[PDB]
């Protein structure tokens, strides 16, 4: 059949003897004096004891066997375990045991009535009195009370852990009651918490079998694995494995007990010799509480027992999910060079012989070359250096067949992609430059995992979506990526920075005077006005829109037009002033795509420069192109983008950054103000502290002035000469990076926290005073330990993001939801009570192609409801926002949809990539992680706030807020500067300490009460005194502030689709027929219990609030969860009860082996597409 759902939970002790049957016992000897393998005990091959001469009877047929001595046609030689499972039995029959029972009071305390001491009896050190015969001391009992001697005071009676098995049926018959008389404990508060947990644990045993077999009475390990043979190589030898020795402390103990018990063995001797047996159980399960090192009493390495290794932390769960081991790929260095811009790649011309060897062998079989496939495996091994004909047949195989190039580490969706292998020379694997901006890494010897897809159904599934010429142009986040990265920008920026070299201001009677005279000396081709224009009258480039401006590029080639934009009149489409330099740009993009008609109305002219706008040109072009042509651009801007800079050259000489000749005296006035604040001390004025910050602000301002003077000196005169600005404006330079070199930047702060006294005498050209560098280093330390510390905690937080949003996939078609969200067009500023334009940078990416909740009327045409408001509509609303017609643009966010198992159709406006609506199959659940999967490295963990709200952890100072909206009420005293809020009702007492105690008045819903300036009280209180109204929005607004501080491109619903997961769980109150009054049912699934039953029972609920890590421990499935930091409690709660895993889930399929429910394997794309015309015609009658 076909794999589908999955089942688990506990298994009765009788079921344990089912899978294992028998074959066990005997010591755990891993060898003998001779015959290292067999041992007839530990890992003995089932029915293999030297020469059993049997067992082969169970097998029907297939082959012969029974060879008397040595071995027959058994598994030992072949099929031995075959990596398959092989349970033993470990026999066992002692008093009792324990399956760890986790550390969340499971299988005990909850189903019983004892804590912090439930182990005292489970470890054979107490007495769980489970009998009634009327005591004496203080009446009888029914639980633990006989702590030694007590149980003998009367001399049933159970002092061992064996009682755990006795409370099986005793709790089973009372189970029905444990669900009735237990729930009988109505409110009363306090204890109404235990009754909830006790009912959840007993709710499992309430149905679907599952008995309290927690009291293990016979374990069953594994033998096939652990057994590593001799491993020489290099300089070493010997070998072995675990799981065996650490297991020897279980069977042997069970046997020795069978030898002691059988003979004369008094109580005391058995009680301790038994507790060690269960200890061995937990020992084989998980080593904790005390541990069990090797070579006792000496301490060394902790024995590996599932914990952290296998079924636990990174060891056999983190490595098997994704970080497996590809059996078809390789690694190499990185290189760059004009290949063809996308559509191609590098990849060696030697190793490729192995990656594409398979099909390559079959090709030669028919191409005369190799006589057979086998022979083709012995012509390329001894490095005979073929380099003959084979390199040709290899091309046929590498024709239209793409390859997947990966980058480590990985970040966002832009971390893989695919190209077409174009074997070059050597071994270095090169790629296109632009692609680097997606991996974030400088070429310095880095590698790239080169994966290769085999199946042809994987090739088309790749080159059609993973091709760099598709899923790279317009990435997620918000802004484009394929845009011309660094370098390229400077290749077109070096020709549009004006040529005004200052010539003066003469005048001619229509070019008959200062035309020839000035051509001799003074006044060249800069200013000077005549008739109307200026010096533009000199080289009139005629031509036309026939074959580009001839006279233009023609004169430039010769010793005429200096190019580099020297101001010249062309003819193009009209008498302009654009220089032949810009003409080139428009000519490059012209022939590239098709006719300048598009680039003409797109490319600007008023403010050319080619600054940080190259991302808008290509972006705006997509609307009139669409990959096919778009790709051509990034290719045209390539060739010229580098050649122009090559056949020109621009070096960074030590003088290239001319020192501000008008700076020296500036420091004089700044230093002349030093004594000013210094002599104030000798006169006893202004506290030493006031003096401190007084001088700080001084240099904090002058620095900006000096930077301004420099940036200015580098603006007017010295245009193209200064490269430090050519990249600072828009290419590959930082503005604050300039004030460092020619500047003087020295406002460094002490290592702890206190800006030093005197700054730093930067001016690199002049070596520091040997003290300046040591002083500036104190601050240049946090700028490296923080970025590197982005793998300590922050790096282990992104996982939490990918776990939460997982089963979120865009499917179905038109769900139909009323309630909608109204995105704010204007935000407030804590500083001053006044809304701002939100800087536009937030509104744009916040409404980029959405779903207008309702008709939008705003001067002119209306924006129909459900209309995909592209970038155009956005600008139309922003520019019309200043007018005063719109304040809250209506829209539909993923936060409004009755579907927790699936995303939503057409609701997630635009698939932010192909410039169109999302496609059914786009796992936004993973894309949402790709959005946040980038800023991580660009943060400051050394304080952390983004995760604070996620886990809903109460922020610093709690930031107390008004839970209710009363009135003013502002009373002050001595130390009780607390503020209250009430109105004709009850008054709460907010012990407001001493800090942000503002006035304010007229009550307040929540706001902040004044003290909570930022990071309002944990969402717990919000939703508690508000609901899923502010919770779902407060995050999308606050959380982004941490991103807006660094100007992030991502935004939109990428972060608005992950919130619905943390707010899709509800509680229970007076349920209908459904058990558990407490409960913790999910959203949609709960709506079902109130949808079908609505045609009858009231099933009210309350919008609960869970963190980000909590949305994993308790989910609709189990395969997920764990990981984080609790791969122990998960499998517990997950077990016991039925808790049947769902089906629709990326992981569920990847792990189990099923196909992806998303991608091309979605339930919306599994039909037929084969019909060569006549096929449909034939079947038409064949039916």
């Amino acid at each position: 059949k076909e794999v589908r759902k999955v089942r688990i939970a506990l298994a009765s002790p009788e079921k344990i003897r089912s899978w294992s049957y028998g074959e066990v016992e005997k010591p755990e000897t891993i060898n003998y004096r001779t015959l290292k393998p067999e041992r007839d005990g530990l890992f003995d091959e089932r029915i293999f004891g030297p020469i059993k001469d049997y067992e082969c009877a169970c097998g029907k047929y297939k082959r012969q066997r029974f060879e008397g001595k040595v071995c027959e046609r058994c598994g030992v030689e072949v099929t031995r375990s075959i990596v398959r499972r092989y349970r033993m039995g470990h026999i066992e029959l002692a008093t009792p045991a324990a399956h760890i029972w986790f550390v969340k009071d499971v299988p005990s305390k909850i189903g019983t009535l004892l804590d912090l001491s439930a182990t005292e009896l489970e470890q054979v050190l107490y007495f769980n009195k489970y009998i009634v015969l009327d005591p004496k001391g203080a009446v009888l009992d029914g639980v633990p009370v006989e702590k030694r001697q007590l149980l003998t005071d009367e001399e049933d009676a159970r002092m061992g852990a064996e009682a755990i098995q006795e409370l099986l049926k005793e709790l089973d018959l009372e189970k029905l009651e444990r669900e009735l008389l237990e729930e009988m404990k109505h409110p009363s508060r306090a204890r109404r918490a235990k009754a909830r947990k006790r009912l959840e644990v007993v709710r499992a045993f309430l149905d679907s079998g599952n008995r309290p077999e927690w009291m293990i009475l016979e374990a069953v390990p594994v033998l096939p694995p652990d057994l590593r043979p001799m491993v020489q190589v290099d300089g070493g030898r010997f070998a072995t494995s675990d799981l065996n020795d650490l297991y020897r402390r279980l069977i042997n103990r069970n046997n020795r007990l069978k030898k002691l018990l059988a003979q004369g063995a008094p109580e005391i001797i058995i009680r301790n010799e038994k507790r060690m047996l269960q200890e061995a159980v937990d020992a084989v399960i998980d080593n904790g509480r005390r541990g069990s090192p090797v070579t006792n009493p000496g301490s060394e390495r902790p024995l590996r027992s599932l914990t952290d290794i296998l079924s636990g932390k990174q060891g056999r769960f983190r490595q098997n999910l994704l970080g497996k081991r590809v059996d078809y790929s390789g690694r190499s260095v990185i290189v760059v060079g004009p290949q063809l811009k996308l559509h191609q790649c590098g990849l060696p011309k030697r190793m490729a012989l192995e990656l594409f060897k398979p099909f390559l062998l079959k090709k030669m079989e028919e191409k005369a070359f190799a006589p057979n496939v086998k022979a083709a495996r012995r012509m390329l091994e001894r490095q005979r250096d073929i380099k003959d004909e084979v390199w040709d047949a290899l091309e046929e195989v590498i024709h239209g067949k793409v390859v997947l190039l990966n980058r480590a580490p990985t970040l966002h969706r832009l971390g893989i992609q695919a190209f077409q292998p174009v074997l070059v020379e050597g071994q270095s694997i090169q790629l296109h430059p632009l692609v680097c901006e997606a991996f974030n890494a400088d070429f310095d010897g880095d590698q790239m995992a080169v994966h290769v897809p085999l199946s042809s159904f994987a090739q088309a599934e790749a080159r059609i979506q993973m091709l760099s010429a598709h899923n790279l142009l317009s990435p997620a986040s918000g802004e484009p990526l394929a845009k011309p990265s660094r370098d390229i920008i400077l290749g077109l920026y070096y020709i549009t920075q004006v040529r005004k070299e200052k010539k003066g201001a003469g005048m001619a009677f229509a070019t008959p005077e200062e035309a020839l005279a000035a051509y001799e000396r003074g006044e060249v081709a800069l200013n000077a006005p005549i008739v109307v224009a200026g010096r533009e009258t000199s080289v009139g480039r005629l031509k036309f829109v026939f074959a580009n401006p001839d006279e233009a590029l023609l004169a430039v080639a010769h010793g005429l037009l200096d190019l580099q934009d020297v101001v010249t009149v062309r003819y193009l489409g009209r008498r302009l002033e654009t220089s032949p330099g810009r003409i080139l740009f428009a000519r490059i993009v012209g022939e590239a795509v098709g006719d300048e008609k598009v680039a003409q109305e797109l490319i600007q002219m008023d403010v050319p420069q080619e600054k940080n706008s190259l991302k808008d040109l290509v972006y705006q072009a997509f609307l009139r192109l669409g990959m096919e042509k778009t790709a051509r651009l990034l290719d045209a801007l390539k060739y010229y983008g580098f050649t122009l800079s090559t056949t020109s050259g621009i070096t960074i000489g030590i003088d290239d950054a001319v020192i501000p000749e008008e700076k020296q005296r500036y420091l004089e006035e700044a230093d002349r103000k030093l004594r000013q604040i210094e002599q104030a001390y000798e006169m006893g004025f202004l506290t030493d502290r006031e003096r401190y910050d007084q001088v700080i602000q001084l240099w904090t301002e002058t620095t900006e002035k000096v930077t301004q003077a420099v940036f200015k000196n580098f603006e007017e005169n010295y245009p193209f000469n200064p490269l430090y600005v050519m990249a600072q404006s828009g290419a590959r330079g930082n503005p604050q990076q300039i004030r460092q070199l020619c500047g003087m930047r020295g406002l460094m702060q002490k290592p702890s926290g206190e800006t030093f006294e005197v700054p730093v005498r930067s001016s690199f050209r002049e070596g520091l005073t040997v003290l300046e560098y040591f002083i500036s280093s104190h601050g240049a330390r946090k700028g490296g330990a923080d970025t590197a510390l982005r793998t300590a905690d922050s790096g282990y937080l992104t996982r939490k993001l990918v776990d939460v949003a997982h089963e979120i996939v865009v499917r179905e078609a038109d769900c139909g939801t009323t309630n909608y969200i109204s995105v704010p067009l204007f935000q407030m500023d804590e500083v001053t009570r006044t809304l701002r334009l939100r800087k536009r940078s937030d509104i744009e990416s916040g409404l980029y192609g959405r779903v207008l909740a309702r008709e939008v009327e705003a001067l002119g045409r209306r924006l129909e409801e459900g209309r995909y408001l592209s970038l155009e509509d956005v600008h139309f609303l922003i520019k019309a926002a200043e007018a005063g017609e719109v304040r809250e643009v209506p829209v539909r966010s993923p936060l409004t949809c009755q579907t927790r198992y699936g995303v939503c159709q057409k609701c997630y406006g635009y698939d932010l990539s192909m410039a169109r609506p999302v496609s059914i199959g786009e796992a936004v659940g993973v894309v949402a992680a790709e959005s946040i999967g980038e800023p991580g490295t660009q943060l400051t963990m050394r304080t952390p706030r983004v995760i604070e709200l996620f886990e809903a952890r109460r922020p610093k100072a709690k930031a107390v807020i008004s839970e209710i909206d009363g009135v003013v009420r502002i009373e002050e005293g001595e130390d009780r500067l607390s503020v209250f809020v009430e109105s004709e009702g009850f008054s709460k007492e907010y012990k407001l300490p001493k800090d942000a105690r503002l006035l304010v008045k007229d009550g307040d819903y929540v706001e902040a009460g004044q003290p909570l300036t930022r990071g309002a009280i944990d969402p717990h209180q919000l939703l508690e005194a508000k609901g899923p109204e502010a919770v779902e929005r407060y995050l999308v607004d606050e959380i982004q502030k941490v991103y807006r501080a660094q100007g992030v491109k991502l935004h939109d619903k990428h972060i608005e689709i992950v919130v619905r997961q943390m707010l899709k769980y509800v509680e229970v109150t007076d349920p209908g027929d459904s058990r558990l009054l407490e409960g913790q049912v999910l959203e949609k699934w709960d709506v079902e219990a109130l949808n079908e039953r609505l045609i009858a029972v009231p099933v009210a609920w309350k919008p609960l609030l869970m963190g980000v890590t909590k949305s994993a421990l308790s989910t609709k499935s189990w395969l997920s969860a764990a990981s984080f930091q609790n791969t122990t409690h998960v499998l517990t709660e997950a077990a016991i009860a039925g808790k049947k895993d769902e089906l629709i889930g990326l992981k569920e399929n990847v792990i189990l082996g099923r196909l992806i429910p998303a991608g091309t394997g979605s339930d919306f794309v599994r039909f037929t597409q084969v019909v060569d015309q006549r096929t449909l015609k034939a079947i038409e009658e064949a039916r």
């Binding site: 030694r148 005391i268 009680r271 301790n272 507790r275 200890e279 005390r290």
Partner: peptide, 18 residues
């Protein structure tokens, strides 16, 4: 701190022989 103490307290609680 090992479980041997639990037995060490039960083994050293009863007197030997005269």
């Amino acid at each position: 701190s090992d479980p041997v103490r639990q037995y060490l307290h039960e083994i050293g609680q009863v007197p030997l022989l005269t």
